[PDB]
């Protein structure tokens, strides 16, 4: 019974208890800090969040952020009725996806050489910075990427 | 000899054994989960895989994916003989690099203002969505980025 | 006093000592390797470094790299006085942000359909690959992304 302490300790040195081990699937809590190099050979799974935005004018926008920091933007739909400098007219970018500093992402017009970009800005509005688009709409594709913080 | 258990345990509390320690270089196996914040100050090394594609029409394409999720695309070569809507004619994107949902990446024509984009789609075909290109080829550069899953 | 060894060991199996635990905030040193899948539910914080470059001709360039590998480029200012093929005239990209292989990032001209790209190359020079720009300057925005190694 004095020797159980030992047996039981030679068990926590293998799995169970509050000890992280060199094998098994385990869970870990708290602000871990790693000063040296680290490596993952398998899959590392950072948190994901995705958001759909009808930016207005016909401009669809699917944003996909991972670990709150880098978000990839996928341009869809078709824009119409905007001036060279205008702030887009539809749904704003949600708090969770809004940049700290302004970020211009570059889209392209489907089946054309003409191009455009839009500014996501911290407040979450999206100003347009392509040429003045007429009532007759043009399809807008292309992927953007910006650091959230 | 009763006290060796102890000595030997006060060793696994330092290194060796199946225990992860606050120092040394160690290896770890199994689906580790980290509920709290984590930090790396050194280098974190996620798995890398790179792929070269002759998309056809003269369009070179070097894809580089890291941790199976985000791949950066580097456009090379020069495209010729394609319509505004056509599916590119050469080697398809391999299974390991194929998106779940379609992704348009935006390239640019070297020494010109004219631009283009192409669609990588889940099956791995690459449809072209720039203007109709004549027999006389044009050089295509620019980097794209898309989430694999 | 023989039993303190035990008490003291049943403490290092909880926190303190050189042992990583399933709870608390701890620090870790050395080349950790993770063969299995890993997961982070909170925030994972990779090292960050940001750099501002006056590329010359009026082309501003803010580069932001994370974990030394992927850097997002933010184009600013306005370019003027460059030929279709020229190497930009102002401050070069610093060693810490210079790619191994050349990377073209695609910018866009503010309030226009016209587009451009520039080549960051390993030595750190930035060759321009848009159309020949006159003395009258044009504003240049858009975000790029390239793998550093």
Swiss-Prot record, chains A, B, C:
Residues 49-149 are annotated as: Host receptor binding. It is found in: Virion. Homotrimer; found as an assembly of 6 homotrimers. Interacts with host phosphopolysaccharides; this allows the virus to bind the external cell wall layer. Interacts with the distal tail protein. Binds to the host phosphopolysaccharides at the onset of infection. Upon activation by calcium, the receptor binding proteins change their conformation, presenting their binding sites to the host, and a channel opens at the bottom of the baseplate for DNA ejection. The C-terminus is involved in host receptor binding. Host-recognition domains point upwards, towards the capsid. Belongs to the skunalikevirus receptor binding protein family. This is Receptor binding protein. It comes from Lactococcus phage p2 (Lactococcus lactis bacteriophage p2).
